[PDB]
Design a protein around this ligand. Structure first.
Ligand code: CKX
Ligand code: CKX
Lengths: 580, 580
């Protein structure tokens, strides 16, 4: 990468200033912004909160459903002291794609709406002056970038997003934005990997800097005491009597990376890390050499009014709810989340399956597929480079429900997995979520996976309601087929659930009632527990969330175990009791 | 005041750094923190979002309902450049009362949970180092501070808040927190007052600084061009062809206040202001010499999960909803809001009745009343000093539903109104909201008001439901009595409404149904419109909001016209159509 993914910090060598707040904002339906000097300032803006999704603020359909080019602007005062440093704009994300301008100058463009965008403004920044940032953003969907979809043209050239995925096309500046200053020679990247040696541990590391000066790496314990120190861009930190990062029982060391010259320090980067190993052994998932059974949910970045907008309050409530259910894991369905989610998971000892936005791929024979592959690999590189050093991240999900039964699909995913392996210093488990169409006798892609993730809806989409006993039989039939393959790999259910309207009660139960959600889960558990190789269950979904409007979605997706405002339906207790 | 209420800005002279994010947090039920040295760091903290109210994150009752002492902590790097500046911690608020520590040292204490707390850390700050802030907060209610209530002690020592008011006792660090650096001689306060002279305007001003050097005041138009300049701490800016700030049609000038010495500028403060006049003439409220009829709502700072936590997203959605109803006004029931609300009202041309938290006073013969009065006047000073220069703020509300029929109450409020007048350079209208118990024949306090605000619930608390025809006659009976008093002042209804459960439909309507809310409002409008001296209507409430639990509150107060997640009930269209 031509930039650092490292989370910004502030110390003697590194500075940061938050650009969060009310920005200026303007829709650009005629695509005339770059033609009309908008990169020097928007002509008729309104105020827009950052971070947030823009959609749900407005009271008119055409604003909520806006698809196309739209613009953000703000101004910030840059302290004189920042002069001649490497000055960067850092966006938590820009959804889905955009071009960053600063002081009227095009700086960078980025494709992919769920990972950091870094824009080097060193040569155009004005220290000791007011500076301007303008962002051209586009939220259209296509088949050459993730997540995939189409764009429909209505009356008067009005664009409408048509997702190939089941979540609302929220967009904008949905995460925090910073302007930062780095030293001219800086720590750009680092990677850690762990080995357990009895009561001791080894922290293997690599550091990438933008210069040739000497590197020192220190490890501090949770009280800030030095426990290990080594010299060099590559080395091993030996940790006596290591306190391991454990499931729902985190312990975090602090790694400190220093660049020195002679007597003085040029740069210092610090980050909390956790000493832990994750391995697949036969059909078991091992955390620190002990089997762990995954218990939790697929989630979304989704909340009333804010859309996918980041807010620590959402993190806090969601983790308190997760803990109350006795969960230990969640999947970042269906895109990398704000970095802050992983920081918190690290502190709370939660396990994360980190997922790239490869959703809506079902297809692999189109002439656009080479471009799609490039995008998919790029997103994978960015995700892994960003998230690899979180102890919470124990697996990568490289797709959700693609077509997998053709040789077209196999050669495609072979390239993605190959690329992912080169990016992850830890080589931790890689997987993807399979839809039912990926039949055991047909699927060609499951051998690429370290463990297999299944999304199954026996009792909802297949033989629901009065046919639920047939659903169970069909479920066991498929699992018997997987069992007979004797693949000797763990299986994790990454989706199963029923749309459930809070307050809809019926005796006997019906599809959409709270009682049916309970009965469906009970049936699914009976099936899960019948197969030794099942090693995890992540329910779909943690909470009701927004989707595209349609005849199958009653104000979004109601397969939540919690309501959208984060309150438990009856089925939440079923999970709580089972996972205890 | 021993500090500045001015909103923080960043420029060559003034620096700011956000402390928002995840803080450390610890409950202190045994009241042991200070004797245990917690000001040096919390021993077993959890993470808590700032800004937010802490209550609704947790999944246990005793955490949600916690009443007593609790502590916050965070750390921040101070740039070395900030040395030789005056360095301050600035809390948007600390709810309800607290003591600020920095680097282990007690800095300041504050009583009053809805206005800024400033802590001068100049002498203890360590520029170029990590610094620590710890805050001890208490959220108990009593009768010597606002808002009033009691604190119940359960037999096991556990405390429970018992409000005398109808909103949940949210508390914590509910607004943004900054650390800021000011020049050693700085602009501390300023006041503007307007006079309209044909097509021109006069901006009279006073500036208070922390030194004796010359002051220059400039006024810039909305495009940044100079329209007026004067020298001196007191003066008049002459504005040719002034573009007045108008209801729902804002125009904002920028005032620029400079301190200078012989070698140049020492400090620069800039703020947007709007040229407008507010006057009461007979039964009319005049804005820029033209009558205005107030149309809008009482609001709350209240949102799912965040509690009263500030978020620009809530501001944006709420103002879009307000504009959609064709409103022009809201009251900050029942406490000053975060400053950002007023900034936005200034931009959107909304009128604000700014209200001090004098709620729950019904009582004035108790030995504790002199201390309550001092608290009330202190909050009034802070509110008016903070908010006086907003063009949106057209009136001060100095109470909500106190006892007003005794001589004790009259002497009390006489002092509050006198104090408020001394603090407001503009001498704008002052008022308070009266309950029904303040009968026209018995109330002694309405003559203190420049206009009268009535809270009335004819058709809800009085003769609701099958008796609504009687309610209308009773309402007209009271209004006929007010009419016969011929007070020649405007009346504004500041509360009227019905609890309404979204989705409860009945024909014929019943109390709590959406249809009844519509019929109740239609009845109230017929009465309002029967009296010339009625000059405004602010419905209770904009949105459903959280209250203490009880047999009368079904998950909070449902008199909202919008739901808590900001969607319109049937009655919302009734307002929209009337106010259009
Ligand atoms: C049978 C595929 C189910 C589908 N899987 C992907 C999720 O993103 C959707 O929300 C989920 C659903 O339809 O509920
Ligand atoms: C008869 C007084 C009514 C009362 N007034 C003050 C508000 O803070 C309450 O919410 C409102 C209510 O009970 O709805």
């Amino acid at each position: 990468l031509e930039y650092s993914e490292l989370y910004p910090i502030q110390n003697e060598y590194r500075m940061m200033q938050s650009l969060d707040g009310m920005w200026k904002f303007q829709f650009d339906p005629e695509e005339i912004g770059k033609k009309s000097g908008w990169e020097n300032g928007l002509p008729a803006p309104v105020s827009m909160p950052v971070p947030s999704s823009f959609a749900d603020f407005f009271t008119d359909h055409k604003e909520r459903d806006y698809c196309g080019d739209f613009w953000y602007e703000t101004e910030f005062y840059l302290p004189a002291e920042w002069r001649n440093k490497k000055i960067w704009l850092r966006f938590g994300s820009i959804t889905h794609r955009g071009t960053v301008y600063c002081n009227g100058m095009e700086i960078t463009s980025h494709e992919g709406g769920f990972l950091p965008v870094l824009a080097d403004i060193s040569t155009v920044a004005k220290p000791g002056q007011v500076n301007q940032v303008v962002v051209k953003i586009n939220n259209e969907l296509n088949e050459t970038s993730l997540p995939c979809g189409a764009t429909k043209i209505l009356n008067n050239g009005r664009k409408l997003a048509k997702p190939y995925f089941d979540f609302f096309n929220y967009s904008g500046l949905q995460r925090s934005v910073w302007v930062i200053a780095l030293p001219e020679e800086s720590v750009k990247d680092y990677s850690v990997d762990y080995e357990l040696c009895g009561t001791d541990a080894l922290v293997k590391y690599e550091v990438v800097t933008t210069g040739e000066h000497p590197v020192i790496v220190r490890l501090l314990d949770a009280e800030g005491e030095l426990v290990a120190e080594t010299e060099g861009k590559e080395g091993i930190l030996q940790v006596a009597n290591a306190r391991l990062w454990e499931v729902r029982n985190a312990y975090l060391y602090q790694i400190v990376i220093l660049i020195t010259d002679g007597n003085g320090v040029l740069d210092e980067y610090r980050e909390k890390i956790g000493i832990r190993t994750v391995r697949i052994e036969g059909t078991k998932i091992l955390l620190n050499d002990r089997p762990v059974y995954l218990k939790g949910f697929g989630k979304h970045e989704d909340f009333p009014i804010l859309g996918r907008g980041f807010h620590w309050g959402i993190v806090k409530r969601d983790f308190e709810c997760l803990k109350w259910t006795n969960a230990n894991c969640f999947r970042t369905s269906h895109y990398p989340y704000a970095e802050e989610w992983y920081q918190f998971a690290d502190e709370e000892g939660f396990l994360i399956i980190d997922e790239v936005p490869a959703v809506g791929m079902m297809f692999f024979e189109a002439l656009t597929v080479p471009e799609l592959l490039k995008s998919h690999i790029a997103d994978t590189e960015e995700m892994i480079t960003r998230d690899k050093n979180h102890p919470s991240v124990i697996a990568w999900s490289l797709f959700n429900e693609p077509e997998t039964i053709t040789d077209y699909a196999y050669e495609y995913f072979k390239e993605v997995f190959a690329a992912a392996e080169t990016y992850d210093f830890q080589s931790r488990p890689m997987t993807g979520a399979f839809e039912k169409n990926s039949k055991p006798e047909l699927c060609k892609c499951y051998p690429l996976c370290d463990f297999i993730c299944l999304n199954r809806y026996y009792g909802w989409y297949i033989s629901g309601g009065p046919e639920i006993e047939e659903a169970e039989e069909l479920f066991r039939d498929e699992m018997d087929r997987w069992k007979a393959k004797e693949l000797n790999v763990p299986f994790v259910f990454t989706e199963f659930g029923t749309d459930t309207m809070a307050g809809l009660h019926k005796l006997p139960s019906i599809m959409w009632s709270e009682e049916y959600q309970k009965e469906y889960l009970e049936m699914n558990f009976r099936v899960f527990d019948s197969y030794e190789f099942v090693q995890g269950e992540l329910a779909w979904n943690f909470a009701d969330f927004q989707t595209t409007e349609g005849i199958m979605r009653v104000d979004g997706n109601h397969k939540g175990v919690f309501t959208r405002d984060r309150q438990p339906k009856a089925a939440a207790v079923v999970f709580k009791d089972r996972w205890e």
